[PDB]
Protein backbone atom coordinates (compact mmCIF):
# COMPACT_ATOMS: atom_id res chain seq x y z
CA UNK A 1 0.00 0.00 0.00
CA UNK A 2 1.09 3.63 -0.47
CA UNK A 3 1.03 4.12 3.32
CA UNK A 4 4.21 2.02 3.42
CA UNK A 5 5.97 4.70 5.47
CA UNK A 6 3.16 4.62 8.05
CA UNK A 7 3.19 0.81 7.84
CA UNK A 8 6.96 0.43 8.24
CA UNK A 9 6.76 2.26 11.56
CA UNK A 10 4.02 -0.15 12.67
CA UNK A 11 6.28 -3.12 11.88
CA UNK A 12 9.16 -1.61 13.87
CA UNK A 13 6.88 -0.92 16.84
CA UNK A 14 5.51 -4.48 16.69
CA UNK A 15 9.15 -5.60 16.79
CA UNK A 16 10.02 -3.58 19.89
CA UNK A 17 6.82 -4.69 21.64
CA UNK A 18 7.74 -8.34 21.01
CA UNK A 19 11.27 -7.76 22.33
CA UNK A 20 9.89 -6.05 25.45
CA UNK A 21 7.29 -8.78 26.00
CA UNK A 22 10.03 -11.35 25.44
CA UNK A 23 12.36 -9.89 28.05
CA UNK A 24 9.38 -9.59 30.40
CA UNK A 25 8.35 -13.19 29.64
CA UNK A 26 11.99 -14.22 30.27
CA UNK A 27 11.76 -12.89 33.84
CA UNK A 28 12.39 -15.90 36.15
CA UNK A 29 9.16 -17.82 36.69
CA UNK A 30 10.10 -21.47 37.23
CA UNK A 31 11.03 -24.84 35.82
CA UNK A 32 9.06 -24.61 32.56
CA UNK A 33 8.89 -21.62 30.23
CA UNK A 34 6.52 -20.94 27.35
CA UNK A 35 7.63 -22.33 24.00
CA UNK A 36 7.85 -18.73 22.75
CA UNK A 37 10.72 -18.13 25.18
CA UNK A 38 12.65 -21.30 24.35
CA UNK A 39 12.11 -20.79 20.62
CA UNK A 40 13.34 -17.23 21.36
CA UNK A 41 10.53 -16.05 19.06
CA UNK A 42 10.22 -12.53 20.58
CA UNK A 43 13.94 -11.90 20.07
CA UNK A 44 14.50 -13.16 16.53
CA UNK A 45 10.90 -12.49 15.49
CA UNK A 46 11.01 -9.01 17.02
CA UNK A 47 14.20 -7.96 15.24
CA UNK A 48 12.83 -9.44 12.00
CA UNK A 49 9.96 -6.95 12.26
CA UNK A 50 12.60 -4.26 12.81
CA UNK A 51 14.44 -5.49 9.71
CA UNK A 52 11.33 -5.34 7.52
CA UNK A 53 11.60 -1.67 8.46
CA UNK A 54 14.00 -1.79 5.51
CA UNK A 55 10.92 -0.85 3.47
CA UNK A 56 10.99 2.59 5.12
CA UNK A 57 13.99 3.12 2.82
CA UNK A 58 11.57 3.21 -0.10
CA UNK A 59 15.59 -5.40 -4.72
CA UNK A 60 15.11 -9.15 -4.38
CA UNK A 61 16.40 -8.96 -0.81
CA UNK A 62 13.36 -6.95 0.26
CA UNK A 63 11.02 -9.51 -1.31
CA UNK A 64 12.89 -12.08 0.78
CA UNK A 65 12.86 -9.88 3.89
CA UNK A 66 9.10 -9.31 3.65
CA UNK A 67 8.45 -13.00 2.98
CA UNK A 68 10.78 -13.97 5.82
CA UNK A 69 8.91 -11.60 8.15
CA UNK A 70 5.59 -13.22 7.17
CA UNK A 71 6.89 -16.62 8.27
CA UNK A 72 7.91 -15.10 11.61
CA UNK A 73 4.46 -13.55 12.13
CA UNK A 74 2.63 -16.79 11.25
CA UNK A 75 4.98 -18.93 13.35
CA UNK A 76 4.69 -16.52 16.28
CA UNK A 77 0.89 -16.55 16.13
CA UNK A 78 0.99 -20.36 16.12
CA UNK A 79 3.52 -20.47 18.97
CA UNK A 80 1.48 -18.12 21.16
CA UNK A 81 -1.69 -20.12 20.44
CA UNK A 82 0.20 -23.25 21.51
CA UNK A 83 1.41 -21.76 24.81
CA UNK A 84 -2.07 -20.55 25.82
CA UNK A 85 -3.27 -24.14 25.36
CA UNK A 86 -0.05 -25.30 27.04
CA UNK A 87 -1.06 -23.19 30.06
CA UNK A 88 -4.83 -23.72 30.19
CA UNK A 89 -5.74 -27.18 28.80
CA UNK A 90 -2.61 -29.36 28.99
CA UNK A 91 1.13 -28.82 29.44
CA UNK A 92 1.79 -30.85 26.30
CA UNK A 93 5.24 -29.42 25.39
CA UNK A 94 7.45 -29.22 28.48
CA UNK A 95 9.99 -26.61 27.35
CA UNK A 96 12.67 -26.85 30.07
CA UNK A 97 13.23 -23.04 30.08
CA UNK A 98 16.81 -21.73 30.43
CA UNK A 99 19.16 -22.68 33.26
CA UNK A 100 20.33 -19.09 33.82
CA UNK A 101 16.64 -18.25 34.38
CA UNK A 102 15.86 -21.36 36.44
CA UNK A 103 18.75 -20.36 38.73
CA UNK A 104 16.49 -17.72 40.31
CA UNK A 105 13.37 -19.97 40.32
CA UNK A 106 14.75 -23.49 40.81
CA UNK A 107 11.98 -25.06 42.95
CA UNK A 108 8.85 -23.72 41.32
CA UNK A 109 6.32 -24.22 38.52
CA UNK A 110 3.24 -22.44 37.16
CA UNK A 111 1.90 -25.17 34.85
CA UNK A 112 0.32 -26.68 37.94
CA UNK A 113 -0.95 -24.69 40.91
CA UNK A 114 -3.33 -27.09 42.63
CA UNK A 115 -1.69 -27.86 45.99
CA UNK A 116 -1.12 -31.50 46.89
CA UNK A 117 -2.38 -30.51 50.35
CA UNK A 118 -6.01 -29.34 50.05
CA UNK A 119 -5.75 -27.16 53.15
CA UNK A 120 -3.46 -24.95 51.04
CA UNK A 121 -6.19 -24.17 48.47
CA UNK A 122 -6.91 -21.10 50.64
CA UNK A 123 -3.24 -20.29 51.13
CA UNK A 124 -1.43 -17.19 49.86
CA UNK A 125 1.12 -19.59 48.33
CA UNK A 126 -1.59 -20.89 46.00
CA UNK A 127 -2.81 -17.40 45.05
CA UNK A 128 0.78 -16.46 44.14
CA UNK A 129 1.01 -19.45 41.78
CA UNK A 130 -2.28 -18.62 40.04
CA UNK A 131 -1.18 -14.98 39.79
CA UNK A 132 1.92 -15.89 37.77
CA UNK A 133 -0.06 -18.33 35.62
CA UNK A 134 -2.56 -15.53 34.94
CA UNK A 135 0.25 -13.09 34.11
CA UNK A 136 1.81 -15.55 31.66
CA UNK A 137 -1.59 -16.13 30.05
CA UNK A 138 -1.87 -12.34 29.86
CA UNK A 139 1.59 -11.80 28.35
CA UNK A 140 1.08 -14.60 25.81
CA UNK A 141 -2.34 -13.38 24.68
CA UNK A 142 -0.97 -9.84 24.37
CA UNK A 143 1.95 -11.20 22.33
CA UNK A 144 -0.52 -13.19 20.21
CA UNK A 145 -2.74 -10.22 19.34
CA UNK A 146 0.32 -8.22 18.27
CA UNK A 147 1.66 -11.27 16.39
CA UNK A 148 -1.71 -11.36 14.63
CA UNK A 149 -1.33 -7.62 13.96
CA UNK A 150 1.90 -8.36 12.06
CA UNK A 151 0.14 -10.90 9.83
CA UNK A 152 -2.45 -8.30 8.77
CA UNK A 153 0.12 -5.65 7.81
CA UNK A 154 2.56 -8.07 6.15
CA UNK A 155 -0.35 -9.53 4.18
CA UNK A 156 -1.16 -6.00 3.03
CA UNK A 157 2.35 -5.94 1.56
CA UNK A 158 3.28 -9.43 0.36
CA UNK A 159 -0.12 -9.79 -1.32
CA UNK A 160 1.16 -6.91 -3.47
CA UNK A 161 4.78 -8.16 -3.64
CA UNK A 162 4.18 -11.40 -5.53
CA UNK A 163 1.47 -9.86 -7.71
CA UNK A 164 4.12 -7.28 -8.62
CA UNK A 165 6.55 -10.20 -9.15
CA UNK B 1 8.89 17.01 11.47
CA UNK B 2 7.90 16.05 7.91
CA UNK B 3 7.86 12.36 8.93
CA UNK B 4 4.63 13.16 10.80
CA UNK B 5 2.86 10.26 9.07
CA UNK B 6 5.58 7.86 10.25
CA UNK B 7 5.47 9.55 13.67
CA UNK B 8 1.69 9.40 14.05
CA UNK B 9 1.83 5.62 13.65
CA UNK B 10 4.47 5.48 16.42
CA UNK B 11 2.17 7.44 18.75
CA UNK B 12 -0.77 5.11 18.04
CA UNK B 13 1.40 2.04 18.63
CA UNK B 14 2.72 3.48 21.90
CA UNK B 15 -0.92 4.01 22.86
CA UNK B 16 -2.04 0.44 22.13
CA UNK B 17 0.94 -1.07 23.96
CA UNK B 18 0.26 1.07 27.03
CA UNK B 19 -3.32 -0.23 26.99
CA UNK B 20 -2.04 -3.81 26.66
CA UNK B 21 0.51 -3.31 29.46
CA UNK B 22 -2.25 -1.72 31.53
CA UNK B 23 -4.62 -4.65 31.13
CA UNK B 24 -1.72 -6.99 31.85
CA UNK B 25 -0.75 -4.90 34.90
CA UNK B 26 -4.42 -5.00 35.97
CA UNK B 27 -4.29 -8.81 36.14
CA UNK B 28 -5.05 -9.75 39.80
CA UNK B 29 -1.88 -9.56 41.87
CA UNK B 30 -2.90 -8.61 45.40
CA UNK B 31 -3.85 -5.98 47.94
CA UNK B 32 -1.79 -3.11 46.51
CA UNK B 33 -1.48 -2.14 42.86
CA UNK B 34 1.00 0.20 41.19
CA UNK B 35 -0.03 3.86 41.12
CA UNK B 36 -0.13 3.60 37.31
CA UNK B 37 -3.07 1.19 37.62
CA UNK B 38 -5.04 3.24 40.14
CA UNK B 39 -4.35 6.46 38.23
CA UNK B 40 -5.54 4.42 35.21
CA UNK B 41 -2.62 6.00 33.31
CA UNK B 42 -2.29 3.21 30.69
CA UNK B 43 -5.97 3.51 29.78
CA UNK B 44 -6.44 7.28 29.54
CA UNK B 45 -2.80 7.89 28.63
CA UNK B 46 -2.88 5.13 26.03
CA UNK B 47 -5.99 6.42 24.26
CA UNK B 48 -4.53 9.95 24.40
CA UNK B 49 -1.62 8.67 22.31
CA UNK B 50 -4.22 7.17 19.96
CA UNK B 51 -5.98 10.54 19.82
CA UNK B 52 -2.79 12.43 18.93
CA UNK B 53 -3.02 10.13 15.91
CA UNK B 54 -5.31 12.95 14.79
CA UNK B 55 -2.15 14.39 13.22
CA UNK B 56 -2.20 11.52 10.71
CA UNK B 57 -5.11 13.49 9.22
CA UNK B 58 -2.59 16.09 8.07
CA UNK B 59 -6.63 23.82 14.07
CA UNK B 60 -6.24 24.96 17.68
CA UNK B 61 -7.65 21.63 18.85
CA UNK B 62 -4.60 19.79 17.52
CA UNK B 63 -2.26 22.18 19.34
CA UNK B 64 -4.27 21.30 22.46
CA UNK B 65 -4.29 17.58 21.64
CA UNK B 66 -0.51 17.49 21.15
CA UNK B 67 0.08 19.54 24.30
CA UNK B 68 -2.38 17.35 26.22
CA UNK B 69 -0.53 14.24 25.02
CA UNK B 70 2.78 15.71 26.23
CA UNK B 71 1.36 16.06 29.75
CA UNK B 72 0.27 12.41 29.61
CA UNK B 73 3.73 11.26 28.51
CA UNK B 74 5.52 13.28 31.21
CA UNK B 75 3.06 12.24 33.92
CA UNK B 76 3.31 8.60 32.85
CA UNK B 77 7.11 8.67 32.95
CA UNK B 78 6.92 10.17 36.45
CA UNK B 79 4.29 7.65 37.58
CA UNK B 80 6.32 4.67 36.34
CA UNK B 81 9.46 6.04 38.01
CA UNK B 82 7.46 6.33 41.25
CA UNK B 83 6.18 2.74 41.12
CA UNK B 84 9.65 1.26 40.52
CA UNK B 85 10.78 3.06 43.68
CA UNK B 86 7.49 2.04 45.30
CA UNK B 87 8.44 -1.59 44.57
CA UNK B 88 12.19 -1.58 45.23
CA UNK B 89 13.07 1.03 47.90
CA UNK B 90 9.89 1.78 49.88
CA UNK B 91 6.15 1.24 49.44
CA UNK B 92 5.55 4.94 50.05
CA UNK B 93 2.16 5.29 48.27
CA UNK B 94 -0.15 2.42 49.22
CA UNK B 95 -2.59 2.49 46.29
CA UNK B 96 -5.36 0.14 47.49
CA UNK B 97 -5.83 -1.35 43.97
CA UNK B 98 -9.40 -2.10 42.78
CA UNK B 99 -11.87 -4.27 44.67
CA UNK B 100 -12.97 -6.16 41.54
CA UNK B 101 -9.29 -7.09 41.12
CA UNK B 102 -8.65 -7.79 44.81
CA UNK B 103 -11.60 -10.21 44.69
CA UNK B 104 -9.34 -12.75 42.95
CA UNK B 105 -6.28 -11.94 45.14
CA UNK B 106 -7.77 -10.97 48.51
CA UNK B 107 -5.11 -12.38 50.89
CA UNK B 108 -1.88 -11.49 49.14
CA UNK B 109 0.74 -8.79 48.58
CA UNK B 110 3.90 -8.31 46.52
CA UNK B 111 5.26 -5.15 48.17
CA UNK B 112 6.70 -7.42 50.83
CA UNK B 113 7.92 -10.96 50.20
CA UNK B 114 10.19 -11.66 53.17
CA UNK B 115 8.42 -14.41 55.14
CA UNK B 116 7.74 -13.79 58.81
CA UNK B 117 8.91 -17.40 59.30
CA UNK B 118 12.57 -17.65 58.23
CA UNK B 119 12.25 -21.36 57.43
CA UNK B 120 10.08 -20.23 54.49
CA UNK B 121 12.91 -18.25 52.85
CA UNK B 122 13.62 -21.46 50.91
CA UNK B 123 9.95 -22.14 50.24
CA UNK B 124 8.26 -22.15 46.82
CA UNK B 125 5.71 -19.75 48.35
CA UNK B 126 8.47 -17.15 48.71
CA UNK B 127 9.79 -17.68 45.17
CA UNK B 128 6.26 -17.13 43.83
CA UNK B 129 6.05 -13.78 45.66
CA UNK B 130 9.41 -12.57 44.32
CA UNK B 131 8.40 -13.75 40.83
CA UNK B 132 5.35 -11.46 40.78
CA UNK B 133 7.35 -8.57 42.25
CA UNK B 134 9.93 -9.10 39.50
CA UNK B 135 7.21 -9.24 36.83
CA UNK B 136 5.68 -5.98 38.08
CA UNK B 137 9.12 -4.35 38.10
CA UNK B 138 9.49 -5.67 34.55
CA UNK B 139 6.10 -4.41 33.34
CA UNK B 140 6.62 -0.99 34.93
CA UNK B 141 10.12 -0.50 33.49
CA UNK B 142 8.83 -1.59 30.06
CA UNK B 143 5.96 0.89 30.43
CA UNK B 144 8.46 3.56 31.51
CA UNK B 145 10.77 3.17 28.51
CA UNK B 146 7.78 3.45 26.15
CA UNK B 147 6.43 6.38 28.18
CA UNK B 148 9.86 7.96 27.68
CA UNK B 149 9.58 7.12 23.96
CA UNK B 150 6.40 9.23 23.80
CA UNK B 151 8.19 12.24 25.32
CA UNK B 152 10.87 12.13 22.61
CA UNK B 153 8.39 12.03 19.71
CA UNK B 154 5.95 14.57 21.19
CA UNK B 155 8.89 16.88 21.88
CA UNK B 156 9.82 16.54 18.20
CA UNK B 157 6.36 17.96 17.45
CA UNK B 158 5.41 20.45 20.17
CA UNK B 159 8.85 22.05 19.96
CA UNK B 160 7.70 22.94 16.43
CA UNK B 161 4.07 23.66 17.40
CA UNK B 162 4.67 26.66 19.66
CA UNK B 163 7.48 28.00 17.48
CA UNK B 164 4.91 27.89 14.67
CA UNK B 165 2.45 29.58 17.07
Amino acid at each position, epitope marked *: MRESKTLGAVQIMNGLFHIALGGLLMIPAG*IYAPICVTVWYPLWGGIMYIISGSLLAAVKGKMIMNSLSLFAAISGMILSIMDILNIKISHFLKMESLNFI*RAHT*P*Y*I*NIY*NC*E*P*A*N*P*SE*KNSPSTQYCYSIQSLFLGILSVMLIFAFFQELVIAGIVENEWKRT | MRESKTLGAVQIMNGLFHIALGGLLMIPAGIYAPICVTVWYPLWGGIMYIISGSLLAAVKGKMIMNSLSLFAAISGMILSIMDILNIKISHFLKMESLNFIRAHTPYINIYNCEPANP*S*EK*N*S*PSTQYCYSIQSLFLGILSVMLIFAFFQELVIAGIVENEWKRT
Partner: antibody
Protein backbone atom coordinates in the same frame (compact mmCIF):
# COMPACT_ATOMS: atom_id res chain seq x y z
CA UNK C 1 -0.38 -42.04 70.45
CA UNK C 2 -0.78 -40.73 66.90
CA UNK C 3 -1.97 -43.72 64.91
CA UNK C 4 -3.81 -44.54 61.68
CA UNK C 5 -5.78 -47.80 61.67
CA UNK C 6 -6.66 -49.52 58.39
CA UNK C 7 -8.54 -52.71 57.52
CA UNK C 8 -5.76 -55.13 56.70
CA UNK C 9 -7.12 -56.73 53.53
CA UNK C 10 -9.90 -56.37 50.97
CA UNK C 11 -10.59 -59.01 48.31
CA UNK C 12 -12.84 -57.76 45.54
CA UNK C 13 -14.28 -58.58 42.11
CA UNK C 14 -13.40 -56.87 38.82
CA UNK C 15 -15.68 -54.01 37.86
CA UNK C 16 -16.83 -53.78 41.48
CA UNK C 17 -15.88 -50.99 43.87
CA UNK C 18 -14.23 -51.04 47.30
CA UNK C 19 -14.34 -48.52 50.15
CA UNK C 20 -11.43 -48.61 52.60
CA UNK C 21 -11.23 -46.62 55.83
CA UNK C 22 -8.43 -45.01 57.84
CA UNK C 23 -9.32 -44.44 61.50
CA UNK C 24 -7.28 -41.56 62.92
CA UNK C 25 -6.53 -41.38 66.63
CA UNK C 26 -4.39 -39.39 69.04
CA UNK C 27 -4.53 -36.10 67.13
CA UNK C 28 -6.97 -33.46 65.91
CA UNK C 29 -8.24 -35.27 62.82
CA UNK C 30 -9.64 -32.15 61.13
CA UNK C 31 -6.39 -30.15 61.45
CA UNK C 32 -4.26 -32.24 59.07
CA UNK C 33 -4.30 -33.45 55.48
CA UNK C 34 -4.90 -37.18 55.02
CA UNK C 35 -3.08 -38.57 51.98
CA UNK C 36 -3.44 -41.91 50.21
CA UNK C 37 -0.49 -43.69 48.59
CA UNK C 38 -0.57 -46.72 46.30
CA UNK C 39 2.22 -49.28 46.34
CA UNK C 40 2.83 -52.02 43.76
CA UNK C 41 6.08 -53.91 43.19
CA UNK C 42 6.10 -52.92 39.51
CA UNK C 43 5.44 -49.21 40.02
CA UNK C 44 6.75 -48.35 43.48
CA UNK C 45 4.87 -45.76 45.52
CA UNK C 46 2.27 -43.60 43.75
CA UNK C 47 0.53 -40.76 45.57
CA UNK C 48 -3.21 -41.01 44.92
CA UNK C 49 -4.62 -37.88 46.50
CA UNK C 50 -5.47 -36.14 49.74
CA UNK C 51 -8.42 -34.81 51.70
CA UNK C 52 -8.44 -32.00 54.23
CA UNK C 53 -11.17 -33.18 56.65
CA UNK C 54 -11.55 -29.68 58.12
CA UNK C 55 -13.56 -28.31 55.21
CA UNK C 56 -13.59 -31.32 52.88
CA UNK C 57 -11.34 -30.16 50.06
CA UNK C 58 -9.75 -32.93 48.00
CA UNK C 59 -6.93 -33.04 45.49
CA UNK C 60 -6.14 -36.02 43.28
CA UNK C 61 -3.32 -37.32 41.16
CA UNK C 62 -4.41 -36.85 37.56
CA UNK C 63 -3.80 -40.53 36.81
CA UNK C 64 -6.29 -41.35 39.61
CA UNK C 65 -8.82 -38.51 39.31
CA UNK C 66 -11.57 -40.93 38.28
CA UNK C 67 -10.43 -44.05 40.11
CA UNK C 68 -10.34 -42.73 43.68
CA UNK C 69 -13.02 -40.79 45.55
CA UNK C 70 -11.77 -39.49 48.90
CA UNK C 71 -14.18 -38.74 51.73
CA UNK C 72 -13.90 -38.11 55.46
CA UNK C 73 -16.21 -38.28 58.47
CA UNK C 74 -15.49 -35.66 61.12
CA UNK C 75 -17.43 -37.54 63.80
CA UNK C 76 -15.94 -41.04 63.63
CA UNK C 77 -12.64 -39.33 62.68
CA UNK C 78 -12.25 -41.63 59.68
CA UNK C 79 -11.00 -40.98 56.17
CA UNK C 80 -12.27 -43.11 53.30
CA UNK C 81 -11.20 -43.86 49.76
CA UNK C 82 -13.55 -45.40 47.20
CA UNK C 83 -12.00 -47.09 44.17
CA UNK C 84 -14.33 -47.43 41.18
CA UNK C 85 -14.37 -49.83 38.26
CA UNK C 86 -11.76 -52.10 39.81
CA UNK C 87 -9.24 -53.88 37.58
CA UNK C 88 -6.24 -56.16 37.99
CA UNK C 89 -4.06 -53.03 38.00
CA UNK C 90 -5.85 -51.79 41.14
CA UNK C 91 -4.37 -54.72 43.10
CA UNK C 92 -2.02 -52.99 45.53
CA UNK C 93 -1.29 -52.05 49.11
CA UNK C 94 -2.98 -48.73 49.90
CA UNK C 95 -1.58 -46.59 52.72
CA UNK C 96 -3.23 -43.63 54.31
CA UNK C 97 -0.63 -41.14 55.50
CA UNK C 98 -0.96 -37.91 57.47
CA UNK C 99 1.14 -34.99 56.23
CA UNK C 100 2.37 -32.39 58.69
CA UNK C 101 4.33 -29.24 57.87
CA UNK C 102 7.61 -29.56 59.68
CA UNK C 103 11.27 -28.67 59.21
CA UNK C 104 10.25 -26.35 56.38
CA UNK C 105 8.45 -28.84 54.13
CA UNK C 106 5.45 -31.15 54.08
CA UNK C 107 6.18 -34.47 55.73
CA UNK C 108 4.43 -37.88 55.78
CA UNK C 109 5.22 -38.22 59.47
CA UNK C 110 2.74 -41.03 60.27
CA UNK C 111 1.52 -43.92 58.11
CA UNK C 112 -1.20 -46.51 58.27
CA UNK C 113 -0.38 -50.21 58.19
CA UNK C 114 -1.79 -50.40 54.65
CA UNK C 115 -4.77 -52.18 53.12
CA UNK C 116 -3.96 -55.03 50.76
CA UNK C 117 -6.45 -54.98 47.88
CA UNK C 118 -6.47 -57.69 45.23
CA UNK C 119 -8.98 -57.75 42.38
CA UNK C 120 -9.86 -61.24 41.19
CA UNK C 121 -12.84 -63.13 39.78
CA UNK D 1 5.29 -34.30 38.19
CA UNK D 2 9.00 -34.92 38.81
CA UNK D 3 10.87 -38.18 38.27
CA UNK D 4 13.14 -39.17 41.16
CA UNK D 5 15.94 -41.50 40.06
CA UNK D 6 17.73 -43.55 42.72
CA UNK D 7 21.14 -45.15 42.30
CA UNK D 8 22.07 -47.92 42.78
CA UNK D 9 18.86 -49.96 42.50
CA UNK D 10 20.51 -52.64 44.67
CA UNK D 11 23.34 -51.92 47.10
CA UNK D 12 25.41 -54.26 49.24
CA UNK D 13 27.97 -53.56 51.94
CA UNK D 14 29.73 -55.51 54.64
CA UNK D 15 28.93 -54.61 58.27
CA UNK D 16 30.75 -51.41 59.21
CA UNK D 17 31.34 -50.36 55.61
CA UNK D 18 30.32 -46.87 54.50
CA UNK D 19 27.60 -46.45 51.88
CA UNK D 20 25.99 -43.62 49.98
CA UNK D 21 22.84 -43.79 47.87
CA UNK D 22 21.77 -40.99 45.58
CA UNK D 23 18.47 -39.50 44.43
CA UNK D 24 18.47 -37.52 41.18
CA UNK D 25 15.43 -35.39 40.39
CA UNK D 26 14.36 -34.59 36.84
CA UNK D 27 14.04 -31.01 38.10
CA UNK D 28 15.44 -29.12 41.06
CA UNK D 29 13.46 -29.61 44.28
CA UNK D 30 13.49 -27.69 47.57
CA UNK D 31 14.12 -30.79 49.70
CA UNK D 32 14.18 -34.56 49.45
CA UNK D 33 12.68 -36.81 52.11
CA UNK D 34 13.83 -40.38 52.67
CA UNK D 35 11.66 -43.28 53.82
CA UNK D 36 12.78 -46.69 55.04
CA UNK D 37 10.60 -49.70 54.27
CA UNK D 38 11.17 -53.23 55.53
CA UNK D 39 9.34 -56.26 54.19
CA UNK D 40 5.70 -56.21 55.26
CA UNK D 41 5.99 -52.83 56.97
CA UNK D 42 4.59 -49.53 55.85
CA UNK D 43 7.23 -46.94 54.93
CA UNK D 44 8.80 -45.26 57.92
CA UNK D 45 9.86 -41.61 57.71
CA UNK D 46 13.64 -41.67 57.94
CA UNK D 47 14.97 -38.28 56.82
CA UNK D 48 12.99 -35.09 56.29
CA UNK D 49 13.96 -31.71 54.83
CA UNK D 50 17.04 -33.22 53.14
CA UNK D 51 19.03 -33.63 56.35
CA UNK D 52 16.88 -33.99 59.49
CA UNK D 53 16.74 -37.48 60.97
CA UNK D 54 13.28 -38.67 61.95
CA UNK D 55 12.48 -39.51 65.57
CA UNK D 56 14.56 -42.52 66.57
CA UNK D 57 16.61 -42.70 63.38
CA UNK D 58 20.22 -43.50 64.40
CA UNK D 59 22.65 -40.60 64.03
CA UNK D 60 24.47 -43.31 62.11
CA UNK D 61 22.46 -41.94 59.17
CA UNK D 62 22.79 -38.57 57.52
CA UNK D 63 21.32 -36.88 54.48
CA UNK D 64 22.69 -34.22 52.19
CA UNK D 65 22.35 -32.61 48.79
CA UNK D 66 20.73 -29.71 46.96
CA UNK D 67 19.04 -28.80 43.70
CA UNK D 68 18.75 -31.94 41.59
CA UNK D 69 21.24 -34.20 43.40
CA UNK D 70 20.65 -35.63 46.88
CA UNK D 71 22.17 -38.47 48.84
CA UNK D 72 21.65 -40.52 51.98
CA UNK D 73 24.82 -41.92 53.54
CA UNK D 74 25.43 -44.35 56.41
CA UNK D 75 28.76 -44.00 58.22
CA UNK D 76 28.90 -47.66 59.31
CA UNK D 77 26.16 -50.03 58.17
CA UNK D 78 24.47 -52.52 60.51
CA UNK D 79 22.13 -55.46 60.03
CA UNK D 80 19.16 -53.34 61.13
CA UNK D 81 19.88 -51.06 58.14
CA UNK D 82 18.95 -53.75 55.57
CA UNK D 83 15.89 -52.21 53.91
CA UNK D 84 14.63 -50.35 50.86
CA UNK D 85 15.07 -46.56 51.00
CA UNK D 86 12.78 -44.29 48.96
CA UNK D 87 13.45 -40.64 48.30
CA UNK D 88 10.39 -38.40 48.03
CA UNK D 89 9.70 -34.84 46.90
CA UNK D 90 6.97 -32.31 47.68
CA UNK D 91 8.14 -29.56 45.33
CA UNK D 92 5.56 -30.38 42.64
CA UNK D 93 2.05 -31.75 42.59
CA UNK D 94 1.83 -34.77 42.55
CA UNK D 95 4.43 -35.70 45.15
CA UNK D 96 6.53 -38.58 43.87
CA UNK D 97 8.83 -41.30 45.16
CA UNK D 98 12.06 -42.71 43.82
CA UNK D 99 12.34 -46.30 42.69
CA UNK D 100 14.01 -47.27 45.98
CA UNK D 101 17.48 -48.51 46.83
CA UNK D 102 17.55 -52.01 48.31
CA UNK D 103 20.41 -52.31 50.81
CA UNK D 104 21.44 -55.85 51.77
CA UNK D 105 24.37 -56.56 54.05
CA UNK D 106 27.33 -58.84 53.26
CA UNK D 107 27.45 -60.60 56.63
Amino acid sequence: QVQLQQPGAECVKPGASVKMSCKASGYTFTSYNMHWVKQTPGRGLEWIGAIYPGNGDTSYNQKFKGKATLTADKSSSTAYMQLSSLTSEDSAVYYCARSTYYGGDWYFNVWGAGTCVTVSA
Amino acid sequence: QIVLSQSPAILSASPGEKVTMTCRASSSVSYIHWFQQKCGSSPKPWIYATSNLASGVPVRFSGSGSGTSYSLTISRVECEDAATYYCQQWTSNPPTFGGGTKLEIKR
